Amino acid sequence: PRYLKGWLEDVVQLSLRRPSVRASRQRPIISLNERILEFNKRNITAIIAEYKRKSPSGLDVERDPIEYAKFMERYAVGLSILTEEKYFNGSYETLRKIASSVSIPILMMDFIVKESQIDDAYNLGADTVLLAVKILTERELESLLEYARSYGMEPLIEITDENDLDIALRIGARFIGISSQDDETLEINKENQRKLISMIPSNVVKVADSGISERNEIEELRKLGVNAFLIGSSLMRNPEKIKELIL
Numbered sequence: 001p002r003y004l005k006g007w008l009e010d011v012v013q014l015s016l017r018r019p020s021v022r023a024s025r026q027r028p029i030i031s032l033n034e035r036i037l038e039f040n041k042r043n044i045t046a047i048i049a050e051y052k053r054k055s056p057s058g059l060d061v062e063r064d065p066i067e068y069a070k071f072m073e074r075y076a077v078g079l080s081i082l083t084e085e086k087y088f089n090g091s092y093e094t095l096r097k098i099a100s101s102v103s104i105p106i107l108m109m110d111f112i113v114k115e116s117q118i119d120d121a122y123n124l125g126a127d128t129v130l131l132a133v134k135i136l137t138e139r140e141l142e143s144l145l146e147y148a149r150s151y152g153m154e155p156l157i158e159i160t161d162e163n164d165l166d167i168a169l170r171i172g173a174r175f176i177g178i179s180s181q182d183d184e185t186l187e188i189n190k191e192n193q194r195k196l197i198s199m200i201p202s203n204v205v206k207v208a209d210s211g212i213s214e215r216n217e218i219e220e221l222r223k224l225g226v227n228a229f230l231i232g233s234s235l236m237r238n239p240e241k242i243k244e245l246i247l
């Protein structure tokens with residue numbers, strides 16, 4: 001990984017030492033990016049419901065993961081399942097129960113810094129992973145995209161700024177997540193995100209996460225070409241809000 005400072009460095013250290021998993025996957029890769037494209041065809045607002053009990057931003061909730069995934073199976077374009085343990089309270093069991101029970105696309109959200117972690121997603125039943133430009137070297141990014149591509153997964157590559165975009169495009173990314181939050185500091189900038197989004201080739205599938213709770217915020221973002229929306233906190237707190245966001 002890159003040399004990092006502070007909480008991010010700590011989590012990348014946790015992550016290098018994370019025990020891998022052994023399981024045979026008993027389900028297909030259901031492609032998150034294609035389904036998002038499919039919901040653009042039908043003009044259905046395409047929302048990735050995130051399941052996370054905790055965030056470094058101070059969310060701290062208990063709720064049943066299986067009931068949540070099931071409720072979201074009906075309206076979500078896919079699910080994002082936090083598996084990082086220390087800062088998000090996630091776990092691989094959560095992903096495994098979640099993947100066993102629904103048949104919409106599932107993304108594994110963690111801090112992937114080694115191949116066995118992508119192996120962990122596949123064996124647990126996730127259909128794709130998030131990669132962070134910001135914690136990987138360019139050679140690690142490229143080869144971890146190649147490695148996820150080899151289980152037939154198109155990874156979601158997170159960019160926070162323009163230098164991230166240049167590295168992402170160069171390494172071949174076609175599925176890009178644009179974060180308003182910078183993870184190393186927790187600097188939130190929604191104007192920086194808007195600029196960044198206009199620079200992305202028309203040919204990449206674009207996912208946006210702010211801290212989205214409002215329908216107008218989704219609408220603005222769609223106008224700029226954003227294909228799908230990663231929404232966590234507000235749906236952790238009121239799942240049924242999803243209905244009003246999809247309408």
Ligand code: NI
Nearest residue numbers: 132158179183
């Ligand atoms: Ni991130």
